[PDB]
């Protein structure tokens, strides 16, 4: 059917703090995966109306994309780094579930996940 609303990026009732891990995830991880050339299918939520995939959101119960993660990092929505890591891994898992192993988008997602996991071991601790 039709499109669902995107995940909320801001919440005035939520506190705003800038920890070391979150500012690292913003200035390094997200920036690196952003200027990557395989990032174009993940810079925005899945437009299931245009791509004509009525069964995407039926299968993917929890959507996520890199644009939502960026808008959540910029608005200090994250409290700890675990939520951002979970958002990244949820995006990867949503991409893996719907498509068939061996498609182009699956290999691009595997590439992005490999780069993310090789940029996530260099995690600095809170100041």
């Amino acid at each position: 059917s039709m499109n669902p609303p995107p995940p909320e990026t801001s919440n005035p009732n939520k506190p705003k703090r800038q920890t070391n891990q979150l500012q690292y995830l913003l200035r390094v991880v997200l920036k690196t995966l952003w200027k990557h050339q395989f990032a174009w299918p993940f810079q925005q939520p899945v437009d299931a109306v245009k791509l004509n995939l009525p069964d995407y959101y039926k299968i993917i119960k929890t959507p996520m994309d890199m644009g939502t993660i960026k808008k959540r990092l910029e608005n200090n929505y994250y409290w700890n780094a675990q939520e951002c890591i979970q958002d990244f891994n949820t995006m990867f898992t949503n991409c893996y579930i719907y498509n068939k192993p061996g498609d182009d988008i699956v290999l691009m997602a595997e590439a992005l996940e490999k780069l993310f996991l090789q940029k996530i071991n260099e995690l600095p601790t809170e100041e």
């Binding site: 990557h36 050339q37 395989f38 174009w40 290999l107 595997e110 590439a111 996940e113 780069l115």
Partner: protein
Amino acid sequence: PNIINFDTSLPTSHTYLGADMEEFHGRTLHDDDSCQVIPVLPQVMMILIPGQTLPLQLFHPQEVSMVRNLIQKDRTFAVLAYSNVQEREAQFGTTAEIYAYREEQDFGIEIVKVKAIGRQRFKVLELRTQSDGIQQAKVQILPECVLPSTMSAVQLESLNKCQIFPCSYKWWQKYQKRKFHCANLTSWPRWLYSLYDAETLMDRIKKQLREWDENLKDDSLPSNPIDFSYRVAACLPIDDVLRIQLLKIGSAIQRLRCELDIMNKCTSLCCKQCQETEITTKNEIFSLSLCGPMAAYVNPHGYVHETLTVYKACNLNLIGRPSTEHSWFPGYAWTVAQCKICASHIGWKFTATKKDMSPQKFWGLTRSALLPTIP
């Protein structure tokens, strides 16, 4: 129209494919009619023409392994010309020699960007897919039918000493009258054999090309009729079946004749999905690249689009904001262009970044979405 200060060399280098590639200066050429066993690429759906630059981006591990194998061997793969694109039918094709490669690390997955060039036409004898998934092709090279001057069969032995020759329209009439004199001995006149003279056809194509490409015919265009015919065929915006018909042609004379027929007949370019929606005309075509107005380029997805550059276009909606990421013409921002009726993807609108550039804006239409049309 206007003028240009863009430098037409950057489009041919494909600078968007990472840093400086590992260029090779060698070249391998098989014998005519000689059979070869060549590997085929799976994702390539293009009808390749000899001399046409072909960039490719491959990320599949199987594709990268095959690319390594070819880099270590003779660096030649087979590009099939599909008559029915869906069922993987292939009767003709063209080989491609790799002349640059670049595997990129500090990158998500292992990916290789390769610049190759079409080499030799061929007929597809046998297609067999291996247990690996990659498919090999047993292939016969098709030769170039270089027919001699038609007057050599009827030349007078006395006039043999006159067959070399030391306002342009009078020189060509002198040429026609002096070279094709012996035509009086046949059943046909001189102007008829002037239609089957490779030099006259090449001059008429040069006239029709000075409309688009402002570069002189001194250095840019080759002198050999076969190379000239293939260079012209590389930048002829036509649909796929016409390109296959042109590729079937062996005699370069027939190739040049059919190309002149196309250039004189087809004037409008419409949407291939609409059939009745004019997009542009032959007049607005101009050459921003050295290889011509229409050249092959590759996107980040790895797809190949034959972009034809035009100055003006009609009936096109513009979707999205301009962007400079992975732009095939540096210093220009692309914007997706759709048909105003069927909304099919027609091409991109390239606007200049710096305000002192020229031209400030042009269009690049993909050949696969265009259809030639005569009134």
